[PDB]
Amino acid sequence: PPSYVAHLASDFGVRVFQQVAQASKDRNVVFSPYGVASVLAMLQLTTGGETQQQIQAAMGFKIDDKGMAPALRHLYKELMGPWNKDEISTTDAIFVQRDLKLVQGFMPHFFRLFRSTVKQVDFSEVERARFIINDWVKTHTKGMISNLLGKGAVDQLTRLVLVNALYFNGQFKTPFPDSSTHRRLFHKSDGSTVSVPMMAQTNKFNYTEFTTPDGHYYDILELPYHGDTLSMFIAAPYEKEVPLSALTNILSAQLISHWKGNMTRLPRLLVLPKFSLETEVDLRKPLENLGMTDMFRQFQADFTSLSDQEPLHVAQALQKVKIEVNESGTVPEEIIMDRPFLFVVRHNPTGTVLFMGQVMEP
């Protein structure tokens, strides 16, 4: 089944998010579990030996195996296929030093599976190479992701860099009335307060409750998007004294599908803060925590499939995401999301977790 890789990719990506959320407590995070899986699958082909095994053990599948790469191409045209061009955009890219002799015949093999190539720049001209990468990412995210490689992120000794960038601005199936958008207090992790704009809409919302093994319970809503393929899942503890760390530290891609399963449509008035969040995640510590340590370590990383002439290791592995949730305007019991909540964008036919993050301060 082609949906067999969608669950492995999302289970791996959500696990990466947990490491990010654990290290980024109290800070806003927008992340793409499918994005880190898609680009780490590309890195599998460039690695070999022990480095490649660490990746395959953590991801749970081999990009070489039969049908895996064609299924991922089918999954990509599945998520970026319902005319979502102006709503969602992404790009994967690996950049290696340009005068470094690569394995002859590897690029046509890399291209056969991903229909892209590993890009080559001269990192010895640091700012030109930084510019070329930033321009490639920006022109491939419809101009929405700027300066992914910040000043100083690479120098003249950089030899290999992995980048991943996604933009999302999906319109809800039923818009929030612009008239109902009001100012309301938001309660933050430190007990302080800030007034922010919040949308509002009463509707029959797909909803369920969820109680962690210790007895604290949560509200979980589903907001459908136009096209009836994607939806955003909102989740927050009912009690403001319970930190979102409790939810994210047991979070699973499987658990999200269980939430959706036990959901029923109830008439609710929902107020939900507008947020426009942009996050750059340094994937080093998260991927190391999941056993992928060799790829970042000099003279330990095995990239012999990409180059058996010179040693290589990943100087930078970065994901930059930008998400926007607005009224989506076109032409009763209450749920107040006035505390740190969790959001999940999900492709319901495939179970793919496209986006995931915490709103600690909108």
Epitope: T208, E209, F210, T211, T212, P213, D214, G215, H216, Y217, E239, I250, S252, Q254, L255, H258, W259, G261, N262
Partner: nanobody, 114 residues
Framework: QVQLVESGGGLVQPGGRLRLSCAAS????????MQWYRQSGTERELVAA????????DYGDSVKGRFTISRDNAKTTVYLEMNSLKPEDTATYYC?????????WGRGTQVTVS
């Protein structure tokens, strides 16, 4: 009307098996988390705990991977599969339903190993 009646306990030899059970009634089982405790002039120690859905489980240090807690919300039951039993496990095992700040308790079941 709120009642949690546990069963399944008994006497086994070291290394034996035991399958605990607790029928629930009188409240909204689907929204409550289910747990399992144990006692013998001591305090009631947490053994296992499960989320209302999703199968998120939690266990004490003494259980390791020997006990597995499950539930069937349609049949309103929480289970406790006890394998590889040892003399340290001899205790009265109580069930409990919790949707904070509301907690309900059972009557207990005695598990004794040689």
């Amino acid at each position: 009307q709120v009642q949690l009646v546990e069963s399944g306990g008994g006497l086994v030899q070291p290394g034996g098996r035991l399958r605990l059970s607790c029928a629930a009634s009188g409240f909204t089982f689907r929204t409550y988390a289910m747990q399992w405790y144990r006692q013998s002039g001591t305090e009631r120690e947490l053994v296992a705990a499960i989320s209302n859905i999703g199968g998120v489980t939690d266990y004490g240090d003494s259980v390791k991977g020997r006990f597995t807690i499950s539930r069937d919300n349609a049949k309103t039951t929480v289970y406790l599969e006890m394998n590889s039993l040892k003399p340290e496990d001899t205790a009265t095992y109580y069930c409990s339903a919790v949707r904070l700040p509301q907690r309900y308790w059972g009557r207990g079941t005695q598990v004794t190993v040689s």
